Design a protein around this ligand. Sequence first.
Ligand SMILES: CC(C)CCC[C@@H](C)[C@H]1CC[C@H]2[C@@H]3[C@H](O)C=C4C[C@@H](O)CC[C@]4(C)[C@H]3CC[C@]12C
Ligand SMILES: O=c1cc(-c2cn(Cc3ccccc3)c3ccccc23)oc2cc(O)cc(O)c12
Ligand SMILES: *[C@@H]1O[C@H](CO)[C@@H](O[C@@H]2O[C@H](CO)[C@@H](O)[C@H](O)[C@H]2NC(C)=O)[C@H](O)[C@H]1NC(C)=O
Ligand SMILES: [Ca+2]
Ligand SMILES: [Zn+2]
Ligand SMILES: [Zn+2]
Length: 779
Amino acid sequence: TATSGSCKGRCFELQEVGPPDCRCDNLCKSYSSCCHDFDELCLKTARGWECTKDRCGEVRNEENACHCSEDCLSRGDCCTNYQVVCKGESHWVDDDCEEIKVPECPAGFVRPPLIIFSVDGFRASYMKKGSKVMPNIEKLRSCGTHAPYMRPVYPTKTFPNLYTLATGLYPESHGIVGNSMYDPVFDASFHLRGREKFNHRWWGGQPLWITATKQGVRAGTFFWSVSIPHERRILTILQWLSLPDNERPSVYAFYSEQPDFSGHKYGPFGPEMTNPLREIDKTVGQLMDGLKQLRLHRCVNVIFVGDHGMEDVTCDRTEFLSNYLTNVDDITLVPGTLGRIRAKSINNSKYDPKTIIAALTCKKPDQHFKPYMKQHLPKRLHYANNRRIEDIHLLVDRRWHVARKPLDCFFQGDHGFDNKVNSMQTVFVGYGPTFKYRTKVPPFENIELYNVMCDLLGLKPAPNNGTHGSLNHLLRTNTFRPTMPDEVSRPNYPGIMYLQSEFDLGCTCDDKERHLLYGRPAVLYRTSYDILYHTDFESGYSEIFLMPLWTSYTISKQAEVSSIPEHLTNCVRPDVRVSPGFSQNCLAYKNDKQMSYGFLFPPYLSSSPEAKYDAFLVTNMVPMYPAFKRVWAYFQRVLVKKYASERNGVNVISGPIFDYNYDGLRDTEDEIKQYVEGSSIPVPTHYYSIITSCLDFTQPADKCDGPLSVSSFILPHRPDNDESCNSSEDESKWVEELMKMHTARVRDIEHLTGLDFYRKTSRSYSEILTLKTYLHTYE
Ligand SMILES: CC(C)CCC[C@@H](C)[C@H]1CC[C@H]2[C@@H]3[C@H](O)C=C4C[C@@H](O)CC[C@]4(C)[C@H]3CC[C@]12C
Ligand SMILES: O=c1cc(-c2cn(Cc3ccccc3)c3ccccc23)oc2cc(O)cc(O)c12
Ligand SMILES: *[C@@H]1O[C@H](CO)[C@@H](O[C@@H]2O[C@H](CO)[C@@H](O)[C@H](O)[C@H]2NC(C)=O)[C@H](O)[C@H]1NC(C)=O
Ligand SMILES: [Ca+2]
Ligand SMILES: [Zn+2]
Ligand SMILES: [Zn+2]
């Protein structure tokens, strides 16, 4: 509420309160207000950002952007090359890499500071496509810890990903579900430009800077008004690092608009990309040079991280909704590399998403987007449980845009696509005493980083979507020790408790260690279920849901596929181990015109004709739409054998998922919205499978003594195959493409089932946590 105090040295100061008296911050330009004689004493430019010999020993001239005077080291406002030019020191990039075993911090530093150097639109492959031009970045990468790439969250846009980095949450949970959003409860829109985004109401979860503050760790200001030149951002961090140790922050963030901006103008692989990459490396070098002359280069942990990649996208490759819909003026479209559609609602509830989606489904052979109800999007995207996400979503093909009409090249790159697309992958490098030395780590998802940044600062993370401990292998020391959750429900192991004569199911037939390689899955909620053993498979059968929670079986490389004898096609047999009242019945299915059934262990993989009869037990049967059985039957008859054949055997765990409220979490019985007609048999929203083998494929899956290899999926249990535009073709032409789109992490299935897998292995639990967060992308 005041525009004219004199920020007594408060330039870029980390201590503020409300109004009046203007604030002294690098965000003042964004609020169009600081003690604006806190301004141009603070934003100088004179004489550039590098000392020259003739400047060495100058008397401090307050007009210079940085200083080469004898009092500058005190304040940290020397040019970062000051000691190299004036004191005979070398550039940090010219020094050999020396392992940092303990933090070497100067007087007054209680903990190693963390600096996050974030770069917008830094595609992972840039780490090579311009490698000879990034000496500082490549040193950090080769001498610290790096992954080949880090996976962003969907949508692969800046604000959803920066806030995921900050909170460890999926966008649906932290609230920043796009760069642009409409919230029906606020009845307001959020935009990259403008002031609406500054209202705290938009931002959920608990970001790193608030986590630190709440726990007594001071945070620098992570955000920079775009007018502040990148060199000044570095010099300000360095000046803050020079504050006394009761004002000095322990965690800092630098941000650069590059290489995103040049990626947009020229595309990710234009020759024009080299200059921005050179400039970014120069800035990294200024930072490392600045840390060295403050004797902090072996004390600070540095993270170099991007928010997303960049793809080739041109105005020529635009789909227009007006080519599909006759009434595009009754709808609002969030356009581009993704689509979100809602009604314009001034005179319109003829708006029905069901018709719009049907009108956007496989209408042109080479159609470059696919419509979805948000709950039918691949579950790995975790993009549905937020009122800011429109019911209608368009997943846009990489390299394409979607727009409303041809009225909506200047740009050649864009991003925002499906986060498993390789062009969207970005970078992670960690460098410092707490990160490992010269260590490469597998790719990981950016939702994991908040836990690590917390660990790096001694903070307890707020609850988030990372898996705490899955990244412990990045860290030399003070990791957090994860422990496996305790099993909640104990199984029963029923024997023969009833005889075939007590069953009134309406079912007929023509019937008159090996399979649990990683230990029994633990059930982490309260329920009643039975362990059922068979020659070919083992299952945990829920007496609540009348169907297995999981079915586990091992299929050797040499396994033979057999068909279902004609006399057995309709066969369903009572299971004398399970009460008829906790059993499904076959009349429910004959009475449900829309529902058929399938089996979790496939009769096609039975080991003998004797054992095949086991596969037809009522305890192995699950409700399946006929459309979905086309998918499931192909998977069980064809794909499982294929996977066994390619991977030297596989262990498979399959089962149902119920997520009618699309929150990514296992439904309670109350939340289940669909049952087989006139029955208590719930209808799954999805069916999962987890396919495990030995990473050393020279060992059979049942004889593995090292790291495991997993691929998993969560297939939508849908009554049609409209998602698959080629489903009228033979299944060999579309089912595997469907499954690859719905690939999943084991962790995703854990949340959706309440089960805990891999509880009995020869691996460390941290190593297992890495396995559970793996995603097989097929990219
Ligand atoms: C003008 C643009 C270049 C920069 C825009 C910066 C803006 C997105 C940032 C700056 C101030 C931030 C909020 C502030 O840190 C307080 C918190 C508390 C935390 O609990 C939730 C997030 C929130 C609201 C920050 C969100 C992002 C803000 C608005
Ligand atoms: O000043 C700006 C700062 C930022 C970001 C800062 N960090 C650092 C960080 C470190 C740990 C956890 C969360 C965040 C980012 C990371 C990823 C993406 C963006 C940023 O993004 C901007 C985007 C704009 O469009 C305009 C801006 O001025 C900024
Ligand atoms: C992602 O993480 C958030 C935060 O832990 C989870 O949301 C929490 O969900 C529980 C269970 O519904 C609620 O009681 C809390 O209100 C939510 N937030 C917090 C801070 O506890 C969310 O379920 C996670 N998503 C997935 C898919 O696991
Ligand atoms: Ca649910
Ligand atoms: Zn970005
Ligand atoms: Zn961008």
